[PDB]
């Protein structure tokens, strides 16, 4: 199921990173 | 000959610089893969034209042998297809990859980068057969994997492949791959691949004048707003041309001016010329005098001089001058791509005059207007003014009882309830810019 | 930074001897068909004198 | 460009036209989408003998357009046409969406398994078992 | 090949009276020879010629929608689904009728769309497109009378099957007239009286403005 199972993993990996650096931005100004 | 030695030294310097730069982009690709940050790949694409031509075929072969030290199936299949170079004793040992680096297979990103570099090289070489074959191999290599990072360079790869195929006039052949790859990108939501693919899909119809098909593909398709400035400019140009040929003019002119403003200020001399030319024809057709500032620009002077003549003739409203200008410049007009709209102008000339009269006066006797617009009949004048009101060019109600042509009234909505609506768009745009700015702060 | 080789770059078409243009900056109404001004008032006046 | 031919009321004639169309559906989808009304009516006409092919064509058209829920529904109406089909991009996407749909339905049952179970179409189960 | 036999042309009120010598032409032969990509060059020879006369038939029978079910091929054929060789009717006595229909209804989009195909002989003229085109060039301005007068310039197939059908729209269009000539009626049309039979401001928008302003505030104070 490399066509699909890999399809979902990327579909929920690239997006989830955007919620990684977003956490810093919310973390950055909080400390400031 | 000292000139030959100097040229060889220059080529060697260029090749060394190019190898260093290629290593730099490879490092950028590795960083982008490690950190899910395609900013470096966007930089590589941006600087891609700069590195179009600085090597030779033997330099490329040696570089590929040194780089793809990994037992890569792509290199293994491509090497036999490549023409075997004649036996040369000079073979420098280029092994930047040792131990872990050599053992690690070369990334498809780097492979595609080098392949497209060869594409550019033998492109300037005009090596169409091998270009096509290499593009097909690249297509299979991309299709084997489903990594988003690849599409970043794969988009320009498709672009160069399409550009090669255009020389061969094989657009009817490309269309299949173009449509399929657009469908795949859409199913994956690859912004840049989608942008370029939609652009070229449109370009096909534009050159082939399948305007109904183009309208379908533009209306039904969806263009993500995060696209690059260049692709946005292309999209706006093509959409403006399609609308203008489609007899819709206001939206076409608005879009064309927006694209022209978005277009690069100093680069793309010919393309800027074309966009200006289409916008000029559209404006003249919509009964508005263009900006005389452009027609004196040194960058866009002679490609328009016929159009300066055309606009002067239309403004003067001299039928003999219009006919003579057409008789003298029809061939150039065809070449540009504006003959249809100019044929429309050839009878729509009087609209600009009616607009100017209805804008300069406030109440004109119908006989006076007939004398003004050389119709030779009050009835003809009445019909024309009704036409002007209907098309939405003038806003005056014609009273066929006292020859009145009553224009608009006193202070309009633009000082009562218009300014608020005007400011709302500005405020929305400014807040949008701020929100994008804050949300694009930083990764670390 | 794009070459934007859409396809065409107009080749100057009828490149010929430079017309020298004019460094002055001119609006649209600059060039018209007219019979001067003094002659205008002259074809004017008469009758009661304009 | 062929819907004009498709407009005939001959059942066999229209089926022949549709089979001709499905070769170039993937490349003329842009315009064909303007012809969704006729295909939807034909599929709604249960009496038509080529309902399976009509369902396949309509599901393909919706797949190109992007309304994946409609595309899955038309695949389900098609039933056994694509069950044989296993290796292709369109079928891959369709099975992706249909498997996700079965996932969601099963999850809904798991969170609300106290009877009143949502009827899972036997076609869904058959396709899941094929996978 | 049901070759000819539809050689009724001459004058059978219904191209072939009954669809038997008419619709039967294709009926299912429609399927037979290739119509979706030298081949059936003879089918190509009767291309839609199988019904060119049938398209003419519809017009020869006030069958209007029909051409719509017809253009499909004559268009594909004259638009040249594939450059072939024998095209002697739509480059002349026909297509331009599609042009009529390209406005006949009232629409223009198409009128001006296809007008790129007629490659260049359009301005080069050919007795054909010329008039089908002259009409809009001589109508868009508003010169409505520019046509009625010598609208009889129909140097081609009837076309009358829409020339009036279109000349009809003008009436309704010119009828559009500062809605809301007393009894003299429009001299471009005037049947007598059968045409007489034919037929914020003051509230400042509170809710919408409140919505927009509150959205301003929402975006101003929102996700830190």
PDB file of C-alpha atoms in Angstrom, chain A residues 1-13, chain B residues 146, chain D residues 92-93 95-97 99-100 103 131:
ATOM      1  CA  UNK A   1       0.000   0.000   0.000  1.00  0.00           C
ATOM      2  CA  UNK A   2       2.953   2.269  -0.718  1.00  0.00           C
ATOM      3  CA  UNK A   3       0.762   4.333  -3.043  1.00  0.00           C
ATOM      4  CA  UNK A   4      -1.662   5.187  -0.231  1.00  0.00           C
ATOM      5  CA  UNK A   5      -0.080   4.411   3.139  1.00  0.00           C
ATOM      6  CA  UNK A   6       2.804   6.625   2.089  1.00  0.00           C
ATOM      7  CA  UNK A   7       0.217   9.048   0.743  1.00  0.00           C
ATOM      8  CA  UNK A   8      -1.286   9.515   4.187  1.00  0.00           C
ATOM      9  CA  UNK A   9       2.074   9.763   5.968  1.00  0.00           C
ATOM     10  CA  UNK A  10       3.146  12.749   3.897  1.00  0.00           C
ATOM     11  CA  UNK A  11      -0.377  14.149   4.116  1.00  0.00           C
ATOM     12  CA  UNK A  12       0.094  14.192   7.910  1.00  0.00           C
ATOM     13  CA  UNK A  13       3.837  14.920   8.091  1.00  0.00           C
TER      14      UNK A  13
ATOM     15  CA  UNK B 146       6.085  10.547  -4.132  1.00  0.00           C
TER      16      UNK B 146
ATOM     17  CA  UNK D  92      -5.867   4.275  -6.680  1.00  0.00           C
ATOM     18  CA  UNK D  93      -7.352   7.614  -5.684  1.00  0.00           C
ATOM     19  CA  UNK D  95      -9.811   3.301  -3.375  1.00  0.00           C
ATOM     20  CA  UNK D  96      -7.905   5.744  -1.186  1.00  0.00           C
ATOM     21  CA  UNK D  97     -10.992   7.844  -0.586  1.00  0.00           C
ATOM     22  CA  UNK D  99     -11.011   3.128   2.250  1.00  0.00           C
ATOM     23  CA  UNK D 100     -10.822   6.344   4.245  1.00  0.00           C
ATOM     24  CA  UNK D 103     -12.408   3.843   8.139  1.00  0.00           C
ATOM     25  CA  UNK D 131      -7.842  -4.571  -1.088  1.00  0.00           C
TER      26      UNK D 131
END
